[PDB]
Design a protein around this ligand. Structure first.
Ligand code: HEC
Ligand code: HEC
Ligand code: MTE
Ligand code: MTE
Ligand code: CA
Ligand code: CA
Ligand code: CA
Ligand code: CA
Ligand code: CA
Ligand code: CA
Ligand code: CO
Ligand code: CO
Lengths: 389, 203, 389, 204
């Protein structure tokens, strides 16, 4: 019944040599995977040095983000800071203010965490409707890496925090500084100065040689190229926690200090960049769920816009404050679907709809859009970002 | 203690710790008037933020929008939205001009801050801002913020048992991103980065 | 004191812009990290297309290996195999022999595992003494990734394994084929056809678009570019399980089918490529432990050549059949040391010394060298690969 | 069943499944003699493996080393070490010549296999290898292997309670890799990939 020549004829790769083991000391993806890259949406910002790009979460699987395509957010661009030039200062309400070199920092006891870094603004363009086409764009200001570094508690212990020191202010070595204020309780819990991400040094654009890792908290607080930890008796109320990363409410007042990222999820396939081209029958629904308030305990999936839900399975572990992969296998009969996913975390929090969020916050929050995403799967297998009501 | 690191020197602390808190902690001795600030702004800022701090093109607007915070599209500026003058001084001193930050003196920054107050209608054109009167300035939106209260206003509502079956939800399509067509595209018109068609030839 | 001008003078990175968010759609490490790359030792083999390179494990932390510097082992080079040209055949003692396309494979239910791939030959050049200088060379034929793919059980269920089928033979699309035989019990347990590794598609050199992942079993069995799964009533006894990956013993007979990789560890720093340059005082001892027989339960560290041991801490999780990171913090008084690490796994197995292995196996085993490694730390902070007795 | 995939055709199976098991499963009809194998070997193999299958330079030796398996440096070849003839046929057919594999016919492979037997002193120079007589050939080391027995011979010993304190072990340095000096090096003579000195200037 017509043999396939890709099997019946010997192909060159089954006869001749491939590339040698000395060809690529540090490799990149095969060229066929060129679509798995960061994308840039120019209209979102006025300058490409104070801007955002997007992780290709439509095309990824599992939970670890490849660092080469893990999103970037800068305010004065990605700076080059050698380990030789690097300095970390601890000052303020401490018994002895200190300067550390990078060599010093490699001598402290080390810890690890695996944690998602989600920009506060992830999905923010979707507060007022359906605007961008693809989960890379509407959910891709996120990455998830295995970090190794030193807990802030051990560094702060060297300096000796005074009892009046209730807040820590962290700033970066870059022009923008990105200064942010932290309550000491969080600092002393699980904030890390990270030097390694997914095995190797941080990438330049991710804060080389040292960044803060702030599990469960908005990405802005993950100060990159960190140069100074100041201990104060009150919050600094810097630009990045007054003008920005404050969330305007219906009465014209705004929430400040919305640090934690709430439970959220998205179906990564099918999605607008991942149409169903293979016809009717078995179909994998894959996606990501995460919460700044702890572990994901389950993810529910709907095919009918939230009229009915089926609990998906967690593939792998549900680690605290980390991306979690879910799957639901279905048999697609070719009918239109309205796909949704809804995360639940260990606190009992259930991911809300966009409408449930807007009923409380209105439309001008800018940040913290964890609303349920809907995909319209059409009869031709094409997939759209829609709202439904 | 492990005995790692060394004591920071005063010159070093002074060089890097330029933060200003809302109560004026971190202010250094100095002064500047509106007229001096206007001249500095003309030379170093207006090319992006406008001669009157009103913004050019799509660069940030630094003055205006008063009373707009319950409009469909709020205009959030120093005058309409920021709570504290400290933040203006600190951010300008540390991070502006954009592309050449940390080029302003203490006095330059007081002057520019005075000019931004003037441009927001908050002081007269002869105002002198100093380290001694700085904390007398109260911005219009000083009381416009409150700490995160999701634990009171959202978490109890969203932690109820959710519906699983025969849920009473509306499922009419109301918004479509394709109507906007403002996503980057591949050459075939698909959203950029779309998966290759494995039924077509490889690139 | 004299103020440090790296703090008292404003540096260009704290004033001018860094790079824009559109500069690098798929990034690489900063140039200062150029030493964190694969290395090739020419003399080990006769051709660079049937050869080995080495993961830079001296420089890594945590447990996830960056796939760009994860070692390669080929027998006819790294081949280019598009998803369009890819075919997977299942034949032999099955009810219906099948051909799958890559598109088809993306439609089966997915699973995940995190697992080390250790070449059977890792450390083999050290069976007879201390030869290479650096743990990259003596322990670096290893990598550890998060895989996503499809269990072989589900693919085989599609074809229908006949009652007579007792062994699975897997072969690659490359000229070398790398055919290996598996007992059905292992196949049906946790062998996966993996498509994703550390979030994204397999790298070309790691088997794109599909490889076997065989938790705990020698790397040679992780067939890359896999093209065919044949079901037979007996082992094939192919070249790669007769001539090679058989382990010569003192009486002139050889073990075959030495599939599992036993508990093993190495201190990655200090190590020969990671000298102590910072003088006396706090020192981090960091390393890796792993076992094909399950989870690592503990790692002990000696500073005196095995006369006395201290239990290290595990940093992160100890997942089954996966790399595990350990740390011991000491206060180095500048004395010479003989550093060793010794892994224990959940079966109670304790990593043996090289001498204990040779007392059973002699010197010509070639493969499966899990002997305890010793580093001689000299008073100048330089570090050597040695044997001691 | 999910209903994925399609039935493989006989031509497709024949093209990809050329494995030969030790009992002769997978052999196809054909034959070849030593003299024909010698000629094929000269044209396609001798450039690496030698005119007598003895190896050139550092390429694999295919004949020799008989009785060397308890020497300090064993010489492991088809004749001295391999258990089954099936493997010879299969591997050659599928994977040699190196750089141009799968260019041998069934008859060519029988002939070459006959020549490798002759080169290992196992048949006379008039031998004809066929699909019918193939499984009559028994290699010298047919009984030289046994399945992994670490569970009997190593795991019980290595799972004993280990020593933590005042362990009676020798700690004299006996071997040093620096004596060999066969590791790749950085320009400064350190092992290649050595960590940069953070006390020295950063690289351009
Ligand atoms: C001359 C010394 C000035 C002063 C006093 C200010 N600017 Fe700028 N500015 C620019 C851009 C792109 C931003 C946004 C940066 C980001 O979001 O990361 C800003 C921001 C400001 C602010 C904050 C506005 C807010 O409401 O948050 C302020 C107070 C400010 N600037 C003051 C761009 C430019 C330039 C373009 C090349 C130039 C020149 C300046 N700024 C100069 C100045
Ligand atoms: C002409 C058809 C032949 C035949 C009959 C054989 N070879 Fe080669 N060979 C070469 C290399 C580098 C290897 C090692 C490959 C690896 O280890 O992955 C081999 C291996 C073999 C074997 C196996 C030997 C063993 O003891 O395991 C056999 C039986 C074999 N070959 C037969 C290199 C070359 C060449 C160099 C360019 C050429 C030409 C050939 N081989 C040709 C043939
Ligand atoms: N120093 C500094 N740190 C920073 C930023 C910055 O501009 N400067 N951007 C922040 C923001 S808004 C986000 S969302 C995260 C993004 O981390 P990434 O670039 O690793 O994705 O970095 C944060 N840390
Ligand atoms: N098809 C094929 N698969 C193969 C090989 C090969 O040469 N061809 N080499 C094997 C060996 S010996 C090892 S150790 C592992 C190495 O996997 P890596 O290249 O991902 O490190 O792949 C295995 N799979
Ligand atoms: Ca000028
Ligand atoms: Ca389009
Ligand atoms: Ca036919
Ligand atoms: Ca010729
Ligand atoms: Ca031919
Ligand atoms: Ca040297
Ligand atoms: Co917030
Ligand atoms: Co083995």
């Amino acid at each position: 019944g017509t043999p396939d020549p890709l099997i019946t004829e010997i192909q060159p790769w089954a006869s001749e040599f491939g590339e040698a083991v000395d060809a690529h000391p540090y490799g990149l993806p095969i060229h066929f995977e060129s679509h798995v890259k960061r994308q840039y949406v120019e209209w979102l910002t006025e300058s490409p040095v104070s801007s955002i790009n997007f992780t290709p979460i439509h095309a990824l699987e599992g939970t670890i983000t490849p660092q080469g395509c893990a999103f970037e957010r800068h305010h004065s661009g990605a700076i080059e800071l050698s380990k030789q030039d690097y300095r970390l200062m601890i000052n303020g309400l401490v018994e002895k203010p200190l300067v550390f070199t990078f060599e010093d920092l490699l001598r402290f006891p080390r810890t690890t965490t695996t944690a998602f870094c989600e920009c506060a603004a992830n999905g923010g363009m979707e507060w007022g409707g359906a605007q961008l086409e693809g989960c890379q764009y509407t959910q891709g200001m996120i990455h998830n890496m295995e970090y190794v570094g030193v807990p802030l508690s051990v560094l702060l212990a060297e300096a000796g925090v005074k009892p009046e020191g209730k807040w820590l202010y962290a700033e970066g070595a870059d022009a923008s500084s990105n200064g942010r204020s932290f309550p000491m309780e969080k600092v002393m819990d699980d904030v890390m100065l990270a030097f390694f991400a997914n095995g190797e040094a941080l990438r330049k654009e991710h804060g080389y040689p040292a960044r803060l890792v702030v599990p469960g908290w908005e990405g802005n607080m993950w100060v990159k190229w960190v140069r100074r930890l100041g201990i104060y008796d009150k919050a600094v109320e810097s630009r990045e926690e007054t003008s920005k990363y404050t969330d305007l409410m219906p009465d014209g007042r705004a929430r400040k200090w919305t640090w934690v990222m709430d439970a959220k999820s998205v179906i990564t396939s099918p999605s607008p960049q991942v149409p169903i081209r293979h016809g009717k029958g078995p179909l994998v629904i894959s996606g990501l769920a995460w919460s700044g308030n702890g572990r994901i305990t389950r993810v529910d999936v709907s095919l009918d816009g939230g009229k009915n839900w089926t609990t998906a399975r967690i593939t792998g572990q549900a680690l605290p404050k980390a991306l979690t992969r879910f799957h639901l296998d279905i048999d697609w009969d070719g009918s239109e679907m309205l796909l949704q996913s809804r995360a639940v975390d260990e606190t009992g929090y259930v991911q809300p709809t966009k409408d449930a969020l807007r009923a409380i916050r209105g439309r001008n929050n800018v940040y913290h859009n964890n609303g349920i995403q809907t995909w319209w799967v059409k009869a031709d297998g094409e997939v759209e970002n829609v709202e439904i009501a | 203690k492990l005995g790692l690191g060394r004591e920071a020197l005063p010159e070093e602390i002074s060089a890097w710790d330029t933060a200003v808190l809302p109560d004026g902690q971190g202010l250094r001795p100095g002064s500047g008037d509106v007229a001096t600030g206007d001249a500095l702004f003309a030379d170093n800022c207006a090319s992006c933020h406008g001669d009157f701090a009103e913004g050019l093109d799509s660069w940030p607007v630094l003055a205006g929008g008063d009373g707009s915070l319950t409009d469909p599209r709020p205009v959030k500026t120093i005058g309409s939205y920021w709570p504290y003058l400290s933040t203006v001084y600190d951010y300008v001193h540390r991070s502006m001009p954009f592309g050449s930050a940390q080029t302003l003196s203490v006095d330059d920054t007081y002057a520019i801050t005075a000019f931004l107050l003037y441009s927001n209608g908050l002081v007269e054109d002869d105002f002198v801002l100093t380290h001694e009167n700085f904390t007398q300035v109260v911005l219009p939106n000083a009381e416009g913020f409150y700490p995160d209260d999701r634990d009171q206003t959202e978490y109890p509502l969203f932690s109820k048992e959710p519906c699983m079956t025969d849920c009473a939800v509306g499922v009419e399509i109301t918004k479509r991103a394709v109507d906007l067509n403002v996503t980057p595209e591949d050459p075939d018109g698909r959203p950029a980065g779309s998966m290759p068609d494995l039924g077509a030839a490889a690139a």
